[PDB]
Amino acid sequence: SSTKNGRDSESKRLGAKRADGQFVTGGSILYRQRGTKIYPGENVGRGGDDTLFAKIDGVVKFERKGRDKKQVSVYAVA
Amino acid sequence: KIDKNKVRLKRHARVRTNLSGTAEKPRLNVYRSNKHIYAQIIDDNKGVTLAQASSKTATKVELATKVGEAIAKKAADKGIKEIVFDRGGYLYHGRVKALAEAARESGLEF
Amino acid sequence: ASLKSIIRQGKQTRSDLKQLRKSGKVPAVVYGYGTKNVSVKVDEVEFIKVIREVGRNGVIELGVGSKTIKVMVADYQFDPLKNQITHIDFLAI
Amino acid sequence: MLLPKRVKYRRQHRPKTTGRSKGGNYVTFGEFGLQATTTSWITSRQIESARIAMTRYMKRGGKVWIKIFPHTPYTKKPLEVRMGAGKGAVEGWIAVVKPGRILFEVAGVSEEVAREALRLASHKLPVKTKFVKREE
Amino acid sequence: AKLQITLTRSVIGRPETQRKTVEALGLKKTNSSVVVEDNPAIRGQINKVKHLVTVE
RNA sequence: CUGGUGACUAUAGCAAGGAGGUCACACCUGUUCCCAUGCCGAACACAGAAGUUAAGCUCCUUAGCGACGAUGGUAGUCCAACUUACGUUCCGCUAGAGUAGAACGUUCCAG
RNA sequence: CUGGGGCGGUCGCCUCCUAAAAGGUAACGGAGGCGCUCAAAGGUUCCCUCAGAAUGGUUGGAAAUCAUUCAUAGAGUGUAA
RNA sequence: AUAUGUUAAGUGGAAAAGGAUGUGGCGUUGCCACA
RNA sequence: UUAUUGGAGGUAGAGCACUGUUUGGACGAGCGAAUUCAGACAAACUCCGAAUGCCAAUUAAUU
């Protein structure tokens, strides 16, 4: 009366790492994902693991890229 | 029948991502046709056109070269040194290739 | 037979709607031409009587805002468990 | 015996059983219907028992419409077993009936004989019923 | 200077979220009173603990 | 209005009935040449008579299909009493329906 | 380890559900995969656009190939999700 | 204790499908007779 | 801890545009599941979508 289920994998902590309107550094991670849920806006790169990081300092803002898509940008202070 | 102009704009979007502003600016745009060849220099972020000069013999090949020297002087009046070339969707050969080599020799490095 | 109706102002709380459905009244809305979605109240037993006379697709001489307006019944919600209506819509012509 | 020919997963979580019915609150196909005023599970075996007892009273009068269907399967472990060591095995197929859903529909008969047919079908089901008609 | 809040019911058996709202108003003991000036920020606090305090 | 090039959840699209013209975009003649088809100068790119606005393009008209959609009521629900299924208060869907809707449009060219 | 022990089963890694719209979250709860392959199946600059349905054509259904028309992906993406 | 109604079962102070001229409250509607 | 503002995230509910399931009609495509008109179901379905909760501002009071 044994079973064949019961195995799972370790959880990979994904999602947003910085809020909206927050000040970030020049190498901070903005989003972990599998695929492209959020596209890289201006002043934001894209890693080899589809990670979204910021290139410069400033405030981070989430925008909309057309219909049923969105992006995230970084603007310098002042 | 197939429209050559409407399928041309599709290829312009595939190249407009890598060079416009992200690579360099201002952007030199080329618009070819079966009767005349045009050109103009645009700003990406501001969204304004700086200079403009176009062709309007030999079915627009030497006149395609003529735009290269005319734009280069219009690019030297206001003063710009570094530029980025936008093919516009056409292959870099022939009429459009002659327009680039003309502006390059006239003190306008790409 | 004519729908003698009164008005209700402000935002009616959830309790007063339950108290309205028990005293024998039914809420309604007139959203025709120029009426500006005026919320209106109406009796229950006097609505079933008039629609039997004229019909489901007949006009009504409803009195709202102390004036006569010719309106018809567009759609209404019905609770099947207690065999009675809960809401009426009036599309003025 | 109503049961789907194939399902994606044989073992599923049991339904909620609490709340109110989504649809099927009015009579659309037939004329005289049968409402429900209590929540319970209607096994497929209880449907064939009520359908035979209903269409028999109407030898060849009219048509009957079954409005529900046993999509969800339930399981039960064998006899004399402790807890755990996996899940059970499929034993039947059930539906979820909430207050307001029409169970059966009858047309092609008179009003006096529709009440007697839908009465014998209500004693076979574990819920309470109410004779309803088409809405004006 | 126009609102006075006194504590009627006790905080035993209440969620910890509601215990921080009473501490943010200055009500330590039972039947204690404070004087505060009305504003959108102070009004929303007693609206959270309405069943524990009464306002005059 | 004629073009070039951008920014904006199809209120920008589909679908149909009409008016367009050799200055401008095209339709079109030919492979000498630059280059080209795992065969085809049809599409890529050179060289260009006449002819047609038939088609693309541009423009008017229409609510057939898509897309935008309040007010009211309902479902659900935070907190709070009764208590286990019912009151009170706050927030407030989906669907559906009266309406929007046959785009806006910054900067450079030729009349 | 174990709804007392023995017998049976299982022990590391990966993907989804259970999980209560951030993240995290158990049970001998419900379903699958891995212990490798690629010398181009990597890099780069150019150029293309699908599976199906339908009228015929050497006729096995008009989809073993060949042509026209529709086709927001119903195809593909070395290998589970 | 006060005002205003309900309930005859000791209900309160233990249980369901189902059965019934127990008794109140608000309605629907056809004969204006049933005996 | 409240007030105001902004954003990330698809549960409750609902729905049939996707995958799977399903009842009765019309209609030659095989004649309700290849098309059509009505009506239903879903932890591993989603064209849609709350209430709460969470991260922030260096925005205001109270502590």
The Cα B101–Cα D24 span in angstroms is: 76
The Cα A3–Cα A8 span in angstroms is: 14
Contact D26 C80 (CB under 8 A): yes
3-state helix, strand, coil in chain E (%, to 5): 25, 20, 50
Spatial distance from the CA of C14 to the C1' of G61 (Å): 66
Closest CA–CA distance from residue D135 to any residue of chain C (Å): 9
Q: b/e for D72-98, b at 16 or more Cβ within 10 A?
A: bbbeebeeeeeeeeeeeeeebbbbbbb
Where is C18: in which H helix or E strand? helix C14-23
Q: Is B10 exposed, middle or buried (0-12, 13-18, 19+ CB in 10 A)?
A: exposed
In the CATH scheme, what is the homologous superfamily, with its name and number, of domain D23-136?
Answer: Ribosomal protein L16/L10 (3.90.1170.10)
Closest CA to A77 of A26, A7, A27, A28: A26
Domain limits for position E37: 1-56
For residue D10, the 8-state DSSP code is: S
Spatial distance from the CA of D56 to the C1' of I55 (Å): 66
Q: Are strands A70-75 and A58-64 parallel, antiparallel or unpaired?
A: antiparallel
**Cβ-Cβ contacts under 8 Å for B105 (sequence gap 6 or more):** none
Of D100, D135, D136, the CB nearest to C81: D100
Q: In whole angstroms, how far apart are CA D50 and each of B53, D44, D94? A: 88, 10, 15
The Cα D93–Cα A41 span in angstroms is: 52
The half-sphere exposure of B83 on its side-chain side, counting CA atoms within 13 A, is 24
Place of tokens 């940008």: A73
Q: Kindly identify which residue of chain C lies nearest to residue D136, measuring between CA atoms.
A: C56
The answer to whether D37 contacts chain C (CB < 8 Å) is yes
Closest CA–CA distance from residue D33 to any residue of chain A (Å): 45
Contacts of D26 in chain C (CB under 8 A): 80
**Domain ranges in chain D?**
23-136
All domains of chain C, ordered by start, with CATH?
Answer: 1-93 (2.40.240.10)
Closest CA to C6 of C20, C15, C19: C20
All domains of chain B, ordered by start, with CATH?
Answer: 18-110 (3.30.420.100)
Closest CA to D43 of D100, D3, D89, D99: D3
Closest CA–CA distance from residue D100 to any residue of chain C (Å): 6
User: Across the strands, what pairs with D97?
Assistant: D40
CATH number of the domain at E36, please: 3.30.1390.20
Q: Please give the tally of structural domains in chain E.
A: 1
The answer to whether A6 contacts chain D (CB < 8 Å) is no
CB A61 within 8 A of CB A20: yes
Closest CA to B34 of B6, B66, B59: B59
**Cβ-Cβ contacts under 8 Å for E41 (sequence gap 6 or more):** none
Nearest nucleotide (C1') to alpha carbon of D126: H17
Closest CA to B71 of E52, B63, A38, B8: B63
Spatial distance from the CA of D66 to the C1' of I40 (Å): 11
Q: Is C17 exposed, middle or buried (0-12, 13-18, 19+ CB in 10 A)?
A: middle
* Resolution attained, angstroms: 3.1
Return positions of chain G under 7 A from a protein CB: 2-4, 8-11, 13-18, 22-25, 27-33, 46-48
The Cα B61–Cα B56 span in angstroms is: 13
